[PDB]
Structures are given as structure tokens and as C-alpha cells.
Design a protein around this ligand. Structure first.
Ligand SMILES: [Hg+2]
Length: 152
């Protein structure tokens, strides 16, 4: 996947994990990972403008707090990204969105809680693949910030 191609291109350390998706947080479950360490990637539209997207990385069970997410990227509000817009920007399908290897470069924020782990798991860009990566290495590849963007 373009996620794996980017890491290899940039020589970023990572571990590839594979599990069997059966077509019809799967990664935490099937890899026996603590859920706090398994991160999803969600896109949002800045001020509801669906070609100005931004990317948020957060534990799979956490809910994205759109007020916090807006404030983290310096915009007035954010709304959930259109299923279609997200796909054309990322090149990935929902349930397989990697923060890595996206087609379009956008701003990226990682939830702060990521920093309490040595490594975290993010989608490898296809169901059944997970990338394990140091949070600071993920941030360096994406020019990402660490900020509080969740509820609870
Ligand atoms: Hg991203």
C-alpha cells in the first residue's frame, strides 16, 4: 500500500502486523492489542468546506471532539468529511484509512494520549494490515502536531 511505500521510501522504522479480515476495532480485537494503543484516522472539513480537509488520528474507541479538532488546526469550526471527499483525498476506503500514504497532503493532528506509548498501531491502508510505529516517528513523517482532540 501507499502507506507501506512511504515508510520504506523514508526509511522510517515500523512493524507490519497482519490479521484476517472476513469481508462481511477489528485490529485491536484480532491482534490482541490494548484499544488505547489502536488508532483510527478520521477526516473533517474546515468550516464545512469539503475540499479543505484535515486529518485526525485518535484511539478507535475515543470519539473525535469537533470543537477541540477545530481549535487544533486554527479554524472556526469543522464538520465530518463527506464519505466521497475523504476517499478521493486519501485514496483509501473507510475502515482502511491510513494516516500514511495519503494522496493529498493535508494538516494532521494526533491525539496527545499517543505519547504515553512507545509505539502505536494505525491502519496499514487496507483491512487486515496494521502498522506499528513510534508516535513521534509518525508525527515527523506527517508534520503532525500532538493535541487533545478527544472526548471522555
Ligand atoms: Hg493524514
Amino acid at each position: 500500500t501507499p502507506a507501506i511505500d512511504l515508510l520504506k521510501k523514508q526509511k522510517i522504522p515500523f512493524i507490519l502486523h497482519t490479521y484476517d479480515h472476513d469481508p462481511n476495532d477489528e485490529a485491536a480485537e484480532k491482534l490482541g492489542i490494548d484499544p488505547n494503543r489502536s488508532f483510527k484516522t478520521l477526516l473533517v472539513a474546515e468550516n464545512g468546506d469539503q475540499k479543505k480537509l484535515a486529518c485526525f488520528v485518535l484511539a478507535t474507541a475515543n470519539m473525535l471532539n469537533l470543537k477541540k479538532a477545530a481549535k487544533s488546526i486554527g479554524v472556526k469550526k469543522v464538520e465530518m468529511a463527506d464519505k466521497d471527499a475523504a476517499q478521493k483525498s486519501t485514496g483509501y476506503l473507510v475502515g482502511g484509512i491510513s494516516p500514511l500514504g495519503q494522496k493529498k497532503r493535508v494538516k494532521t493532528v494526533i491525539n496527545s494520549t499517543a505519547l504515553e506509548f512507545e509505539t502505536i498501531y494505525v491502519s496499514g491502508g487496507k483491512r487486515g494490515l496494521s502498522v506499528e510505529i513510534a508516535p513521534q516517528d509518525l508525527a515527523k513523517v506527517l508534520g503532525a502536531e500532538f493535541t487533545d482532540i478527544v472526548d471522555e
